[PDB]
């Protein structure tokens, strides 16, 4: 009758056809990851190209339905995914040149290596060599050579490639009604046509800026603590009031202080929570580690797994002849067929990783009944944020004592809680301003506020102001540090880590109140609380059919990122970092550098 | 019938109607291939803008789930009319004393 029948009919046609075609690429990817062969990789790319071509052919009808006078949110969100042309707005030469840049940038980043100045015959590759130098090795000279040489050999070569990547991407985004490709990433959270829950694209810029200043009281105290500990190991280079060198952060990109735990132990005499020895004595294996993990998911009140879920999953590497990808990955093959790939071992690192990947399945299985275009997460934050809250609760010793891995006689005191709690802040608090740093710099580059010659000049300036970090050697205009990151060279968004980080504690606070936990969140344990998993599933089942702000309003009590549950998690840590910083300066001083004289 | 009727790539011999200009009646059947019209323009026998071919094939693959797998369904309707009974159940018996 009306025009409304066209969209409701066209989407059902696409939701019928795009369903099976997309799964052919997913199961083709499953076959490749389970058996890396020249035969499976061809079907993987052919299946993706087949489905990818179907998406563009279908856009001819998606664009003939104006969404101007339409109020149906279901019709708008689904057609908007197909109405966007993306890379199809430019000519084949510009689109192909873009992929040639990304393919070349990924190769230069992947094949990077550094030989020692005294051993020209021993070059260490990006993985596993140089990552071990920044993570495990404590030698000042080795950490410096791996950092500065990486910037000159890999950073400089990616600078001219990153220039073409920005200008080509900006033309694509601007053609799709955006300000720049920086705003394109911000469009993941956009909401239009809903009263009281709308969300502008550029609103993410004020949100990260607002939450950043609220993180600073917790970050400035941790920055002085790690600086004081690293100063004792490197007193001839680190001042007690200056900045932290960039090559002593724990990685080749300066993102996590997790590798600095050995140098920043609160109490090296007291024990930690670890059930590695407890599991092997009980004769646990990859299946039992997965099975008892399911009891936690059922104990909270979430749906259990299907018989085909465990039967078709991967638990180890089936030989070198059919070597599989041992990386943890939660797979949605479709038609209710969900699986996980993991080479699980008997250790606590795999105990929590299993809950992490299983949490990803709970996300996808919840909204699996939605339409195909709406069978996806509302945003990248919700996808990965829900994964960590289930593993962090399992890491709580209260759950281990109930399961029986951690013995009941294991004492718990404020001293041991700081050993675990401070270890997380090095990962969370030591990374939150760093993600805000990179995306703020990149967002200014896509918009064009920083000239292409002033990339290294402003990058060093932002490092001293935001994070309080300085390079080990001065870099001229020819260097490009953030281009040497994996997420940057491969056209990936890094803002999701900031959003996922704060959303993680937000959802945790909502469930801890549901499970009735008193005190800080670090001792929270939602295990054996049927109301906890029940309230979560009400949010997981929404998918992307409603605004993400609506999901946060009725669950965590907010419509955007917030730092309140972060300080609640690290509440006693703020008292510990304060006590440790009594003999040092809180914050940082931009006038100090390791090469100063 | 997932172990019986499913096929690699979907059993295209089993199909069903997705759209119809009107609702069916009890025990009604219709196998027409008329294009479902929504707008005022004629479809000209082809689907597209405000036009859609109503029938579509099933995705009965061996990897389907409990909700998507094929189920051999049979409906047994009983009729009690003025005409005499033509079908009944079996009656019990025993030995002969």
* Coil, helix or strand at residue A123: strand
Q: Is A328 annotated as a binding residue?
A: yes
If phi > 0 it is left, if psi is from -120 to 50 it is alpha, else beta; for residue A116 that is beta
Contact A5 B67 (CB under 8 A): no
Residues ≥6 apart with Cβ < 8 Å to A379:
A188, A189, A499, A544, A548
Neighbours of A318 (CB within 10 A): 13
Give the helix/strand (H/E) hosting A352.
Answer: helix A348-366
Residues of chain B found within 8 Å of residue A337, distances taken between Cβ atoms = 63-65
Tokens of A62: 């998606």
What is the C-alpha separation between B3 and A590, in angstroms, rounded? Answer: 70
3-state secondary structure of A199: strand
Using an 8 Å CB-CB cutoff, list chain B residues near A306: 65-66
CB atoms within 10 A of CB B95: 4
DSSP string computed for A230-280: HHHHSTTT--SSSPEEGGGSSSSSS---GGGGTTS-S-SSS-----HHHHH
Contact A3 B39 (CB under 8 A): yes
Cα(B2)–Cα(A372) distance, integer angstroms: 23
Cα distances (angstroms) measured from residue A429 to each of A67, A216, A231, A423, A564 = 43, 9, 20, 10, 13
The two counts, helices (H) then strands (E), for chain A are 24, 6
Q: What is the dihedral of CA B10, B13, B16, B17, to 10 degrees?
A: 110
Chain B residues near any Cβ of chain A (below 8 Å): 10, 18-19, 36, 38-39, 48-50, 52, 56, 59, 61, 63-68
Residue A459 assigned to a binding site: yes
Q: Please tell me which of the candidates A5, A12, A20 has its beta carbon nearest to residue B18.
A: A12
CA separation for the pair A352, A314 (Å, rounded): 17
3-state helix, strand, coil in chain A (%, to 5): 60, 5, 35
Cα dihedral A384, A385, A387, A393, rounded to 10, equals 160
* CA torsion, ordered A36, A41, A43, A48, to nearest 10 deg: 120
Among residues A381, A460, A496, A480, the alpha carbon closest in space to that of A166 is found at: A480
Give the 3-state DSSP-derived string for A276-320, with helices as H, strands as E and coil as C.
Answer: HHHHHHCCCCHHHHHHHHHHHHHHCCCCCCCHHHHHCCECCCCCC
A223 is in an annotated binding site: no
Evaluate the CA torsion angle A454, A455, A456, A462 in order and state its sign. positive
Mutation target vs A (from B9, B21, B36, B49; most A CBs, 10 A cutoff): B49
Which secondary-structure segment (H or E) carries A355? helix A348-366
- Phi and psi dihedrals of A150, rounded to 5? -65, -35
Structure tokens at B51: 């036009």
Cβ within 8 Å of residue B32, ≥6 positions away:
none
Give Cα separations from A294 to A59, A298, A300, A358, A538 (angstroms). Answer: 42, 6, 10, 8, 19
Give which of A523, A526, A525 is closest to A573, Cα–Cα.
A523
The answer to whether A479 touches A151, Cβ cutoff 8 Å, is yes
Choose among A420, A82, A486: nearest CA to A261. Answer: A420
Cβ-contact A341, A331 below 8 angstroms: yes
Dig out the tokens for A36 from the structure. 């890396």
Q: A28 and A43 in contact (C-beta within 8 Å)?
A: yes
For A169, phi and psi rounded to 5 degrees? -70, -35
Take residue A21 and report the two structure tokens written for it.
Answer: 């075609």
Residue A252 to residue A155: CA distance in whole angstroms: 12
A494 near A438, Cβ under 8 Å? yes
What does DSSP assign to residue A476? -
Burial class of residue B5 in the structure, from the number of CB atoms within 10 Å of its CB (0-12 exposed, 13-18 middle, 19+ buried) = middle
Q: Is A306 on the interface with B (CB under 8 A)?
A: yes
d(CA A145, CA A114) in angstroms, rounded, equals 8
Neighbours of A295 (CB within 10 A): 14
Interstrand relation of A469-470 and A244-245 (parallel, antiparallel or unpaired): parallel
3-class SS letters over A27-65: HHHHHHHHCCCHHHHHHHHHHHHHHHHHHHHHHHHHCCC
Residue with tokens 């997309």: A22
Integer distance in angstroms from the first to the last C-alpha of chain A?
Answer: 80
* Contacting residues for A71 by C-beta, under 8 A, at least 6 apart: A193
Residues A320, A321, A327, A329, Cα dihedral to 10° = -150
Q: How far apart are CA B60 and CA A26, in angstroms?
A: 17
Nearest residue on chain A to B8, judged by CA atoms?
Answer: A24
CB-nearest to A335 from B50, B56, B65 is B65
CA distances in angstroms from A487 to A106, A182, A267, listed in the order given: 10, 14, 35
Q: What is the resolution of this structure in A?
A: 3.2
Q: Which residue has the tokens 């200008």?
A: A167
For residue A505, give Cα distances in angstroms to A200, A421, A512, A555.
Answer: 24, 14, 10, 12
What is the token pair recorded at B12? 């295209």
Residue in A417, A394, A422 with CA at minimum distance from that of residue A272: A417
Rounded to whole angstroms, the Cα distance separating A254 from A431 reads: 8
Separation of alpha carbons B19 and A195, rounded Å:
33
Contacts of residue B41, defined as CB under 8 A and 6 or more positions apart, other chains included, come to B49, B50
DSSP string, A182-193: HHHHHGGG-B-S
Q: How many CB atoms lie within 10 A of CB A570?
A: 24
Instruction: Name the nearest CA neighbour of A496 among A257, A188, A172, A77.
Output: A188
Q: How far apart are CA A377 and CA B75, in angstroms?
A: 39
Residue A498 CB coordination number (10 Å): 26
Give the DSSP letter of residue A87: G
Tokens of B13: 């011999």
Confirm if A214 and A563 have CB atoms less than 8 A apart.
Answer: yes
Spell out which residues of chain B touch residue A57, defining contact as CB-CB under 8 Å: none
Task: Give the integer Cα–Cα distance in Å for B36 and B50.
Answer: 8
Which residues, 6+ apart, have CB-to-CB distance to B10 below 8 Å? A20, B57, B58, B59, B60, B61
CA distance A517 to A508: 11
Q: Which of B50, B64, B68 sits opposite A5 (nearest CB)?
A: B50
For A505, the token pair is: 């504690």
Cα–Cα distance, A297 to A315 (Å, whole number): 19
Determine phi and psi for A131, rounding to 5 degrees: -65, -30
Q: Could you tell me if A571 and A519 are in contact, meaning their C-beta atoms sit under 8 angstroms apart?
A: no
Report the residue of chain B nearest A11, measured CA to CA: B52
Burial of B18 (0-12, 13-18, 19+ CB in 10 A): middle
The secondary structure of B44-63 as a DSSP string is TT--BTTEE--EEE----TT
Task: Centre a 10 Å sphere on the Cβ of residue A68 and count the other Cβ atoms it contains.
Answer: 4
Q: A3 in contact with B at a CB cutoff of 8 Å?
A: yes
CA angle A423-A483-A479, nearest 5°?
A: 110
Please, are residues A511 and A536 in contact by the beta-carbon 8 Å criterion? yes
Strand A113-115 versus strand A123-125 pairing type: antiparallel
Find out whether A186 and A507 touch, Cβ atoms under 8 Å: no
CA distances from A560 to A198, A551, A557 (A): 11, 10, 9
Give the residue numbers of A annotated as catalytic, written as ranges: 357, 487
Helix A455-462 to helix A432-447 angle (10° resolution) is 150
Tokens 């937000």 belong to A506
SS (H, E, C) A391-427: HHHHHCHHHHHHHCCCCCCCCCCHHHHHHHHHHHHHH
Residue A336: both structure tokens together: 């209710």
- Residue A128: is the preceding peptide bond cis (ω within 30°)? yes
E-strand stretches of A355-502: 469-470
- Rounded CA-CA distance A375/A491 in Å is 23
Subunit contact A335:B49, Cβ cutoff 8 A: no
A339, containing H or E segment = strand A337-341
Question: In B, which residues are within 8 Å of A336 by CB distance?
Answer: 64-68
From B61's Cα to the closest Cα of chain A, the distance in A is 9
Cα distance between residue A482 and residue A455, in whole Å:
9
Alpha-carbon Rg for chain A, nearest whole angstrom, is 25
Which residue matches tokens 């939605």? A370
Contact A403/B at CB under 8 A: no
Helix/strand/coil for A549? helix
Which residue, A7, A51, A60, is CA-closest to A29? Answer: A51
Q: At what angle do helices A38-62 and A73-83 cross, to 10 degrees?
A: 120
Helices (H) and strands (E) in chain B, counts: 0, 4
């Amino acid at each position: 009758s009306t025009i409304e029948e066209q969209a409701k009919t066209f989407l059902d046609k696409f939701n019928h056809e795009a369903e099976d075609l997309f799964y052919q690429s997913s199961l083709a990817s499953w076959n490749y990851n389970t058996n890396i062969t020249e035969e499976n990789v061809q079907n993987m790319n052919n299946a993706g190209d087949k489905w990818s071509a179907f998406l563009k052919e279908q856009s001819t009808l998606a664009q003939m339905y104006p969404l101007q006078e339409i109020q149906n949110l279901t019709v708008k969100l689904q057609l908007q995914a197909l109405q966007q042309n993306g890379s199809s707005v430019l000519s084949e030469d510009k689109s192909k040149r873009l992929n040639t840049i990304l393919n070349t940038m990924s190769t230069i980043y992947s094949t990077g290596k550094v030989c020692n100045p005294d051993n020209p015959q021993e070059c260490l590759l990006l993985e596993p060599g140089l990552n071990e130098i920044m993570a495990n090795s404590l030698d000042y000279n080795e950490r410096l050579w791996a950092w500065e040489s990486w910037r000159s050999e890999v950073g400089k070569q990616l600078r001219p490639l990153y220039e073409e990547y920005v200008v080509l991407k900006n033309e694509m985004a601007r053609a799709n009604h955006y300000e720049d490709y920086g705003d394109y990433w911000r469009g993941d959270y956009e909401v239009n046509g809903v009263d009281g829950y709308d969300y502008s694209r550029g609103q993410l810029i004020e949100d990260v800026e607002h939450t950043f200043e609220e993180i600073k009281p917790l970050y400035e105290h941790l920055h002085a603590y790690v600086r004081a500990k690293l100063m004792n190991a490197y007193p001839s280079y680190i001042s007690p009031i200056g900045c932290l060198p960039a090559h002593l952060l724990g990685d080749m990109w300066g993102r996590f202080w997790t590798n600095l735990y050995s140098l920043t132990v609160p109490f090296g005499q007291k024990p930690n929570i670890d059930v590695t020895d407890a599991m092997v004595d009980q004769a646990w294996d990859a299946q039992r580690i997965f099975k008892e993990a399911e009891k936690f998911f059922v104990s909270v009140g979430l749906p259990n797994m299907t018989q085909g879920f465990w039967e078709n999953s991967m638990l180890t590497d089936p030989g070198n002849v059919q070597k599989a990808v041992c990386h943890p990955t939660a797979w949605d093959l479709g038609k209710g067929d969900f699986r996980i790939l993991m080479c699980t071992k008997v250790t606590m690192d795999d105990f929590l990783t299993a809950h992490h990947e299983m949490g990803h399945i709970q996300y996808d299985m919840a909204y699996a009944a939605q339409p195909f275009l709406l069978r996806n997460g509302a945003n990248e934050g919700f996808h990965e944020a829900v994964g960590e809250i289930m593993s962090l609760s399992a890491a709580t010793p209260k759950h281990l004592k109930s399961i029986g891995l951690l013995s009941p006689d294991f004492q718990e005191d404020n001293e041991t809680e700081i050993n675990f709690l401070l270890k997380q802040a090095l990962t969370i608090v030591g990374t939150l301003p760093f993600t805000y740093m990179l995306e703020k710099w990149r967002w200014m580059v896509f918009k064009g506020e920083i000239p292409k010659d002033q990339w290294m000049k402003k990058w060093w300036e932002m490092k001293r102001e935001i994070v309080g970090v300085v390079e080990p050697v001065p870099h001229d205009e020819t260097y490009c540090d953030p281009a040497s990151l994996f997420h940057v060279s491969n056209d990936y968004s890094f803002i999701r880590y900031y959003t996922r980080t704060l959303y993680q504690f937000q959802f945790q606070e909502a469930l801890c109140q549901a499970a009735k936990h008193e005190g800080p969140l670090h001792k929270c344990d939602i295990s054996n609380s049927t109301e906890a998993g029940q309230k979560l599933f009400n949010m997981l089942r929404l998918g992307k059919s409603e605004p993400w702000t609506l999901a946060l309003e009725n669950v965590v009590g907010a419509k955007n990122m917030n730092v309140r549950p972060l300080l609640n998690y690290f509440e006693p840590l703020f008292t510990w970092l304060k006590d440790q910083n009594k003999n040092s300066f809180v914050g940082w001083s931009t006038d100090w550098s390791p090469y100063a004289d | 019938s997932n172990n019986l009727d499913s096929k690699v790539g979907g059993n295209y011999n089993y199909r069903y109607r997705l759209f119809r200009k009107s609702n069916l009646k009890p025990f009604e059947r219709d196998i027409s291939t008329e294009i479902y019209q929504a707008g005022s323009k004629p479809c000209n026998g082809v689907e597209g803008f405000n036009c859609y071919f109503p029938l579509q094939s099933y995705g009965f693959q061996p990897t389907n789930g409990v909700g998507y797998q094929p189920y051999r369904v049979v409906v047994l309707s009983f009729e009690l009319l003025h005409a005499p009974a033509t079908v009944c159940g079996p009656k019990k018996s025993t030995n002969l004393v």
